[PDB]
Design a protein around this ligand. Structure first.
Ligand SMILES: Cc1cc2nc3c(=O)[nH]c(=O)nc-3n(C[C@H](O)[C@H](O)[C@H](O)COP(=O)(O)OP(=O)(O)OC[C@H]3O[C@@H](n4cnc5c(N)ncnc54)[C@H](O)[C@@H]3O)c2cc1C
Ligand SMILES: Cc1cc2nc3c(=O)[nH]c(=O)nc-3n(C[C@H](O)[C@H](O)[C@H](O)COP(=O)(O)OP(=O)(O)OC[C@H]3O[C@@H](n4cnc5c(N)ncnc54)[C@H](O)[C@@H]3O)c2cc1C
Lengths: 483, 103, 483, 103
């Protein structure tokens, strides 16, 4: 049987590109579509997906801008640096951010052509189980078709603004808009309790904006709540206001500002409203109902098995668009790559979704991998789980007199205190967590932490002498200081 | 106020005096220099108590004897014996203590 | 047989205190001496040892001061922060540093009395194999004696200024002096190629001082030279001059400055000369010849076996003062604690000195654990060692347009590429290395790194997709960017 | 100079022209704006060559066709065919190339 291509993938994000490059290195003729449908506010960007354009990358860059601000304001004087007229320029930051994103667009493109993947900037959809019909440049004037031996859907997600709130869609921005915003954000309401919400709140506030967060959930659902609270608390100390249990019910434009009326009937004027209440699968324009592919609402996500197969044998899904897969770039990339090998290199690897490490870039950072305390109690029983922990002061911070940090390990008593949960709150969380994540995959036990020599002075060494347990009921507060 | 600078001098003032309150402070301690001016105010106000400061680094032996573990620490001595101990730089907390014995 | 104390230790540094506190928790009557002999410049400090007073602690604090400076000067403008009249105050920094050191003095003291260890601020020495004679406050007016069932020497080291260089001892400062220096350092010559030398040069330069390093041969002996070079190079780019293969031969005071004449007959005016060419065992005043205890020169260090025994059965040595033991605080602490248990709790633990992690706080940081490339070739043969590596750009740095970073793994082909060397150059090295060090102790293999999911974006994730090898001869340069 | 802005226009100038040198540059690229004024100077000096700039982000299809992977890239086209390719912002390197075909 003959096909135009061996592999045709819809999505030039991390999952799609990885899967495509990898399939081409094992002989396949690959074609990849990436087109960017405009945001609620009509924003668009180049090749690469969510991560490079409107996710991890510009997120991390603005975090650094804000973390920088905190250093000038909180720590610089104590350390002997003096200056005047400290101010921040929103436009300048955006150009630096966008300019570096544009460079990544280019390298990602040249990366595709080197790997021998044909790239088409076209809006794509399913005709039948081996045929994709694309619209070149997204124009509906000229439709084309192409066939493939295997089709991968990796269309990712987009931020969801709710239907049943008046003026939201028309007035608010999302993460697709914030990293390229042409105006100063000004006084800002952020709606949502996800890390995106917390991270954006964080940097806008560090930057010097009056920032409010509206939550009718709990901060960081599914993360360890002790850490989640410590992070929230720290953000409150830094100036971000939280309206707990209240959300906007109406939004009205008036005099280039937004009047927001909340569920509690109170109302408030803002300069910008950023919705960050969750993302949904970008499948609507893919014509999946026609092949009767089973999907889930309200994820709006494709149901795929452990081998990334949909209920259509020639069609596959990796990454954000697939139900129950962690929404991290490295996860989409590895799943993509593994699928590409099972298909075109006769591999029998299976994507492993356990012990995935992650890290949140809030004004105090939090890295984690494995089970939270609560979820460990739930699944193994409280009396079979030991929790080691310690609150402590970061050395560089504690000398300023502006606990900052928490080191927490979650262990299985019946498997010799093998570590199944790692959680760390404090500076450079992503850098600390990576090696630890690896240790958890090697089935590390608590005594292994004890016999490892620590690096002094670092926040990470706290995990190497951790002895207070939750069930000892002893204090794990930060000592000192003075005291 | 008046700052004690030896072990002999210290027990002397707890001996030949009936009510005495002591401020245990450190030169490198933030909150012990902060509550320090407010301490000077009760010196004059409540003359039914002799106010003294002890540097913790300097009179090492006294600091070992009163069980000083955090600054600022306040200890009330009546008839030569410690009866109360307050840990903290709260101006409000200190006012509630000196009033308990003087006013 | 009756003794005054079960355990008498000489040294209130990390090793001595740890060994004392630990022995007291297993029943022992412990007495500990710590007295601080003044520096070449007559500098002294409180309880705790080298680490807290004139080492890791004030080092890390000043590093933070200088790293802060680099951020203002190199990155802040690109990120939108504007300010005027940026300057640094040496006096202010020293008070912040010293004030936090003084707080640690206090907590260390109260820590000793809580553990039930008797502390005497006294200069101590050996009378005989169970007797120590001390001088209270270091006065020679009143000598006392005390006996002990076991004696621990943990007297550490002191910086060594050379005898055969005119005016060195009389004119130069050392690490014992720099963290409390009353004057501005001004134009500074640093002599030495150790991490102390590199670290001090680093921060003085970040702080804004004209800094020269006299180096003989190569920097960071013992470390991976690829990383050592990358670090040097980066320091050169930031402004520190290196005089390679030349050292001072004479130093002369004149007009409150120091004229230095080098081996190459050239000469130069400096404000401050800091010697950092190595430390020596502080044993001279201990009267060890009298018990015929074997020591080594030119370490001036006590020879101790793997159980920390000297050739005198009642006498032991841990930490810096002991030959061939890594000069890191956590190393002294663990050895101390293990000795305390073998002695007073019948333990048969043995201090493990393999895979000790470390981290250098140079203006670009470098963390390492395990073998360098070269030493692996030497001990296993080049053809049996694979080296994976990758130069890359830190995300936050590469957006400034001011390779920054290197990730390097060293593996044994004949043990399934088990990782025996980890080396990382880039920001937050100490935080990255800790979890990795642990992984090396779990006998991690290169494929384990490959199956661990990465945390994006972080410098540490570079180790999770490392595929160029030295023997592939392929490029491992940083891509981009532009390009 | 003159900046090409489509695929049609691009192959047109490599067709109906004998000697043509092209500057592949990016707006976000440091070294491509840096060697950019010096490029304007050879425009007038060596009229035995038609000088053109192509933005790499803008004419995506040309950039895929000439194998542009780094900026600034310089490609010499003689009789409609690429013959030389220089990668770099060295003013010296560019002078050696334009002299190879024009002067
Ligand atoms: C604000 C924010 C911050 C984040 N931060 C992090 C972080 O710090 N670390 C981390 O690991 N993860 C982060 N993420 C998550 C991460 O970006 C995603 O998991 C990652 O993008 C993987 O998604 P993907 O590869 O499956 O597809 P996506 O990256 O979402 O991209 C899919 C591509 O498909 C395209 N597309 C859709 N339909 C079509 C069509 N019909 N034709 C052509 N093209 C189409 C899209 O335009 C898009 O380019 C963040 C996300 C957000 C929103
Ligand atoms: C500038 C610098 C930076 C450093 N940075 C780091 C770092 O970032 N990380 C790290 O892990 N390590 C660092 N170190 C090393 C670390 O300080 C040592 O490894 C550690 O202090 C060793 O502890 P110790 O108990 O063996 O000896 P010491 O800490 O030196 O303690 C010895 C104490 O005993 C006293 N003494 C000597 N003789 C007598 C006597 N006869 N009677 C009474 N007292 C006596 C001394 O005053 C001294 O305080 C650094 C060192 C320096 C110099």
């Amino acid at each position: 049987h003959t096909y135009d291509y061996d592999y045709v993938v819809i999505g030039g994000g991390p999952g799609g590109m990885a899967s495509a490059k990898e399939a081409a290195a094992h002989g396949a003729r690959v074609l990849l579509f990436d087109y960017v449908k405009p945001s609620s506010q009509g924003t668009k960007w180049g090749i690469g997906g969510t991560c490079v354009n409107v996710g991890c990358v510009p997120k991390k860059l603005m975090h650094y801008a804000g973390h920088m601000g905190s250093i000038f304001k909180l720590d610089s004087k104590a350390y002997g640096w003096k200056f005047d007229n400290l101010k921040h320029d929103w436009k300048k930051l955006v150009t630096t951010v966008q300019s570096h994103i544009r460079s990544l667009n280019f390298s990602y493109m040249t990366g595709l052509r080197s790997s021998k993947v044909k790239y088409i900037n076209g809006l794509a959809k399913l005709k039948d189980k081996n045929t994709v019909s694309y619209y070149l440049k997204g124009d509906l004037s000229k439709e084309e078709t192409v066939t493939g031996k295997y089709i991968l859907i990796a269309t990712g997600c987009r931020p969801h603004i709710p239907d049943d709130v008046e003026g939201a869609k028309e007035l608010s921005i999302t993460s697709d808009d914030i990293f390229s915003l042409k105006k100063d954000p000004g006084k800002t309401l952020v709606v949502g309790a996800s890390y995106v919400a917390l991270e954006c709140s964080g940097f806008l506030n560090s930057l010097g904006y009056d920032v409010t967060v509206a939550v009718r959930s709990i901060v960081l659902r599914g993360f360890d709540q002790q850490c989640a609270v410590k992070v929230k608390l720290y953000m409150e100390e830094q100036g971000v206001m939280f309206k707990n249990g209240i959300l906007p019910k109406k939004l009205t434009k008036m005099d280039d500002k937004i009047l927001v009326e909340f569920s509690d009937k109170t109302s408030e004027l803002y300069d910008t409203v950023l919705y960050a209440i969750g993302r949904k699968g970008d499948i609507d324009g893919l014509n999946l109902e026609s092949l009767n592919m089973n999907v889930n609402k309200s994820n709006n996500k494709i149901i795929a098995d452990h081998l990334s197969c949909t209920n259509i044998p020639s069609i596959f899904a990796v990454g954000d668009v697939a139900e129950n897969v962690p929404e991290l770039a490295p996860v989409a990339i590895k799943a993509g790559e593994i699928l590409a090998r099972r298909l075109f290199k006769d591999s029998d690897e299976i994507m492993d979704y356990s012990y995935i490490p992650t890290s949140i870039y809030t004004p105090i950072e939090y890295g984690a991998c494995g089970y939270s305390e609560e979820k460990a109690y739930e699944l193994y029983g409280k009396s079979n789980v030991e929790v080691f922990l310690q609150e402590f002061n970061n050395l560089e911070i504690s000398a300023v007199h502006r606990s900052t940090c928490l080191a927490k390990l979650v262990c299985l008593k019946n498997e010799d205190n093998r570590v199944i949960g790692f959680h760390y709150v404090g500076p450079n969380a992503g850098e600390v967590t990576q090696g630890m994540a690896l240790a958890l995959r090697l089935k590390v036990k608590k005594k292994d932490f004890d016999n490892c020599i620590g690096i002094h002075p670092t926040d990470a060494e706290s995990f190497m002498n951790l002895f207070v347990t939750i069930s000892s009921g002893l204090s794990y507060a930060a000592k000192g200081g003075c005291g | 106020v008046k700052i004690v600078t030896s072990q002999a001098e210290f027990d002397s003032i707890i001996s030949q005096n009936e009510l005495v309150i002591v401020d245990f402070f450190a030169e490198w301690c933030g909150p012990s220099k902060r509550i320090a001016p407010f301490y000077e105010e009760c010196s004059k106000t409540y003359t039914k108590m002799v106010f003294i400061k002890v540097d913790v680094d300097e009179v090492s032996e006294v600091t070992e004897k009163e069980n000083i573990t955090s600054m600022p620490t306040f200890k009330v001595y009546k008839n030569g014996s410690s009866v109360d101990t307050l840990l903290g730089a709260n101006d409000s907390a200190l006012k509630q203590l000196i009033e308990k014995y003087a006013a």
